[PDB]
Structure formats: C-alpha cells, structure tokens
Design a protein around this ligand. Sequence first.
Ligand code: ZN
Lengths: 57, 232, 59, 121
Amino acid sequence: PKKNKHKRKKVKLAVLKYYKVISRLRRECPSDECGAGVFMASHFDRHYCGKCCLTYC
Amino acid sequence: RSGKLPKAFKIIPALSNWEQILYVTEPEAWTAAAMYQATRIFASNLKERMAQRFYNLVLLPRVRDDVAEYKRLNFHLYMALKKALFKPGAWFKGILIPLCESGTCTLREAIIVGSIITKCSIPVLHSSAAMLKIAEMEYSGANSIFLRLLLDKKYALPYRVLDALVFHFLGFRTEKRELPVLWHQCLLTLVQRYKADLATDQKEALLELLRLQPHPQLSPEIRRELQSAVPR
Amino acid sequence: SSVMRRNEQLTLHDERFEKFYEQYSNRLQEVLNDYYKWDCESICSTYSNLYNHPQLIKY
Amino acid sequence: FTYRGVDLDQLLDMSYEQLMQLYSARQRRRLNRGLRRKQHSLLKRLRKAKKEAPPMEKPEVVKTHLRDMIILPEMVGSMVGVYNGKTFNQVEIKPEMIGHYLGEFSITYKPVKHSRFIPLK
RNA sequence: AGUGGAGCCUGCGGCUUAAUUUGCACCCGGCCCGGACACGGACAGGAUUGACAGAUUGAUAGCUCUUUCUCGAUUCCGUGGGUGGUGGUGCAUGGCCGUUGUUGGCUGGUUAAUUCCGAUGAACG
Ligand SMILES: [Zn+2]
C-alpha cells in the first residue's frame, strides 16, 4: 500500500488542438483576468477555466 | 488537522482587500498545516509582490519565534518554507534578505534556511542578486552561511558579483576581531569553486589577506588553492 | 561598486540587478452562497536416506 | 414476526419520538441523547444503497467502522458490514435484530482453544 | 485469627490472539513527507505547480482514480558501500541570573458595595 506520487500525463503538443489551419476551436473565458488566450476546457458535460475556476455547464 | 479547506479560503489570491481578511483571520493563532496550505495557495496561483508582502508580514516572524521557542523547525513549517521557495524572487526579497538586515538572525535559522537553499535548484540571476545584496551588507555569523552554501551552488558567477565579494574582503583589512573557522570555510569554498575566474591582483590580494589573517588549520589549504589556480 | 574590474575574458550576460535593490466580484458572493503442522525442524523427519545410493565397490 | 405486538409496516410508519418507548432503557437514553452526524450519514448511504438496487435481490453491501449504531426498523433488510478491528463482517439485518447494537454481530476476539515421568531404575 | 478447600476479583507464569503493550507503550487499515555531490538519461517540440466536478474509501481528498485547463525552468528519473545533516552526544570555551538592611510614595459596561473586568516614583547607609 505504498503511496506512489502522481505523474503528469505528458501529452504530445497540447497546444496543437485549439486552432485551425485561424479561429478558436475552444471558446474563451469571459472573466476580467482571463481572456484572449485563456482557453476553455470542454469536458463531456461541463466547461472549465484553468485560472479563475469558473463552473459553466 | 486534516480534511478539505473551505472554498471561501481558496479565493483570497483573487480577493482585493487581503489585509483585513488576513487580520480578522488572526495570523498569530494559526496551526502548522493551515499555514502550509496558506503558503501553498499564496505561492501557486499568486503574483510576486503581494506574495512577498505575505512572506514579510506573517511567515518570517512565525518561523523566527517558532525556532526561538523549540530550537527546531516543524515539519509543516519546513514544507511551507519550501513552498515559499517555489517562487524565487518573492522569497528572496521577502524572507531571506529581510532576515539578513534583521540583524538578530541566529546560527540555527541560518543553517535551516541554508539547507532549504541547498535542497532546491534556484535561478542563477536571483542567486547573483542575493550574493550582491548580501555582500553589500555588514558581516555577522549568519550571512556567511548563505555565502558558503550559495558558493557551493557552483553557478555561473557574474563578475560584478565577484568584484562585490572581493570588495567585502577588501573591507576586511585591518580588523583585529577573531573571525571564526567558518570564515576560512567560506574562503575555502570560494577558492575551490572560482579559482579559475580570479585575476592576478585578486591572487596577491587574497595572499596578503592570508598573511594578515592567518589560520592554524585551514590557511595552508588556502595557500595551496591560491598557488594552484589556473588564470582566467 | 568597485574599482578593480574584469579586464579580460568574455563577460557573457549583462547582470540585471535593477529590479532587486530598488524594489524595496460576483464570484465572492457565489462562493459565499456556496458556503452555506510442520516447521523447518520437524519436516527434516520426512526425508528418507535409502533410495539413491551409489553402487558400492567392495574390498 | 412482531415486536412488542407491533408489525414492521407501521413500525416504519411510526414516529422517531414514540418509537422510543418501545425500546429498552439503554436505547431510550441513547435516543434521548441524540444521534451524531455519522449516524445520519450512514443512514443516507444505506438508503442510497436500497434505492439503486434492482427490485428482485438484496442491495449492495455498505461497510463501516461504526459499531455503536442501534439497529432501527429503517435498517431491516439492509446489507451491512461492520469492522471488528481487523476484518469486515457482512450481515443481513433481520427483523429480530431490532433492538441491539451493530457491534454485537462482529466479534472482535477469537475463541480460546487451549506424559509423566516413570522410574526405570 | 487464619491462608492452603469452594465461588468471585486480582498478580506473576503459561496457553489462545492481529494485539491480548510493558520493565497507550500493542494490533488492523488511510494520509503526509523522504538529502546534496558525482555521472548518465528526459526538459521550452516542454520539465513542473495549482484545480472545479464525479469516484474509491470506514468516510473526504488534485494527499490518490477519471477527463483536460493552466504555472512555466522555480526542473525530475537512475546508480553509488563516496560523504552526510532541521540529526543525538561530551570536553575547553565568552557573557547573564539567583545564590552564599532603613525610610518614604478613570470613557465603558458590572455589583449590595471605592465589587468585577476593562484603559491607565524615590532616596539613606
Ligand atoms: Zn477565467
């Protein structure tokens, strides 16, 4: 039952999925500190901002 | 003791009037794990300057009077100080240097935060700033420990920093007061790491320093390392 | 500062120190509402000593 | 089955406050002194276990350390596992179990299961 | 007068036990952390930090198990019979206590009450 430390999933080129060719494939955080680059996590039911932690469903 | 923190406590990094919020939270009455979590949230998602203000106001007097009380550092306090080290610039300008001109730093706090220095890799530019701002200030029994350990970091030393350090050693010409074996240990680490970056005038300068300030045990090592140094 | 200086051999970087010495809400109400039988010695009696004997050469 | 001349259906329909007189003095004093947060917590967990069960067979097993629950008629039919210090014992709450503590049904100790010289010369 | 007999309680042994701690110390489960030095690996194509929600769990929890958002050099992987340091421990060692007379000198609430809390010096031998 030894506690193994968590290891981050090193995904190849995490940046290369929010754009085309131009536009934003993910929407933008509408907050004050967040926007114009703070991209929106889109899980299968829900939406996440990684800085200010807004909960959008 | 344990369990999830309230979500009203994790919004203080984004909260404006932080001073009254922390004051009504009574900073002197915290426990160790709560302070560790506070340093975590104020060193992870926070900026530089108000995190530095946090380091000045709360963390430094608490660690100071705690090691005054118990002559050791608590486990959660050590983790909190490491998490404060996770942001380099705020920690240097908020914890290390304020304790440096505090003047009342003891040997135990110095060796504890020097061990904390040695346990993590720091940026070279912040280390050079630390060496400049510690060489510009007066000598005690505590700042030399950071001199010795941050020379033991063995980074690419800027040469203005070297001029400042040798200018401090110029500051020690004719004083009679017996500086300890740790002084010669700092000189030993300096001549062990940066003997290849010294010009000739530095060589005879430390030679006449050796003549004026002798040591029955480590000074032959200083003569050996000065005489066996490859010029830059 | 000082007066005895480099004089030779390739200063790499330019040693920025000017930032060190001279340095010295709907979500609020939202989270406010969110607030409220054998051993090693006995088994030796099991082993026999009468099966695989080498053939004996007599005198 | 009946308990003090009362059947289980209206026992579930009886109140919390006048069920108290049907029990013994220890249980009545405990019900006087209130139940704590873990008590209603495991009550909600066993209710959730009963709710998500298919209606033909018994629900899933809910396990706990908490040995000082009094078995109430709400819990009749539940699948409860109680820690006896080392392991969990899984037991079905019968209607006959209606007064006792849960900790009576997982014993924390094991039963104790425990040549003369004759002269030859 | 007893004890040694009987029932019950207790102490050492011994036996059972995960433990039946010992001349809360014990047991069963869950957290948290845990060197530098050297050399070889990964690292801006990205090292690594933080995290809502759901779950495992006896319970919750980015301290873990899912799904991605963000912090970016504040780095993290392996091998050493090489040291070791928030270690424990004695000696020499500098400062500092205590140790081997005499005469003076009220905003506030609160109670039976100059009640309670609360702000608020000198010489002589
Ligand atoms: Zn945002």
